[PDB]
From a paper:
The Q63NT7 protein from Burkholderia pseudomallei is 212 amino acids in length (molecular mass 22.5 kDa). The N-terminal domain was predicted to fold into a β-barrel composed of eight antiparallel strands. Polar residues are found covering the exterior surface of the β-barrel, while the interior of the β-barrel is lined with mostly hydrophobic residues, without space for a channel through the barrel.
Finally, we continued to optimize the crystallization conditions and identified another condition that grew well diffracting needle-shaped crystals that were suitable for data collection on the synchrotron microfocus beamline. We were able to collect a complete data set from a single crystal, which could be processed in space group P212121. We refer to this crystal as form 3, since its unit-cell dimensions were distinct from those of forms 1 and 2. Form 1 crystals gave a combined LLG value of 719, form 2 crystals gave an LLG value of 394 and form 3 crystals gave an LLG value of 305. Importantly, the Phaser statistics for molecular-replacement solutions using the refined form 1 crystal structure were much improved over those from AlphaFold-predicted models; the form 2 data set gave a Phaser LLG value of 624, while the form 3 data set gave a Phaser LLG value of 662 (compared with LLGs of 394 and 305 for the AlphaFold models). The form 3 model had an R factor of 27.3% and an R free of 33.3%. As a result, no biologically relevant interfaces could be inferred with confidence. One potentially relevant exception is that the form 2 noncrystallographic interface is present as a crystallographic interface in the form 3 crystals.
Residue numbers in the entry: 5 to 67, 78 to 135
The structure:
Amino acid sequence: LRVGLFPVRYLVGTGLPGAPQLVLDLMVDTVDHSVVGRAAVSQAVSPPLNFHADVWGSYVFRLAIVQISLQGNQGGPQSNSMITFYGELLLKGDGKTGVASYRYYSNGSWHEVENVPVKAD
């Protein structure tokens, strides 16, 4: 428990049956402005979409928005694997709600999810 770190969990998605769902488990170091964690994308479709990536990035606060930029792959930033994930979270100033877009790589192609709600915990 260093002073500048706290965790946060984000629920990203419309929440509609069959819509894509992203859960981000992030650790936030408020010193370096850095973010690290895991992204899990699922979808209750046939067949099922079960995308996962180790993610890292940073955040920027703009007056009140908190913008979180993420990219991800299999293994983290020290892995030399290709990035299979991009995400951008625009939280409202309270840091509990906002909008997000992301891209993940699956079946030899990229898939983009744009402007979906975000919730904390």
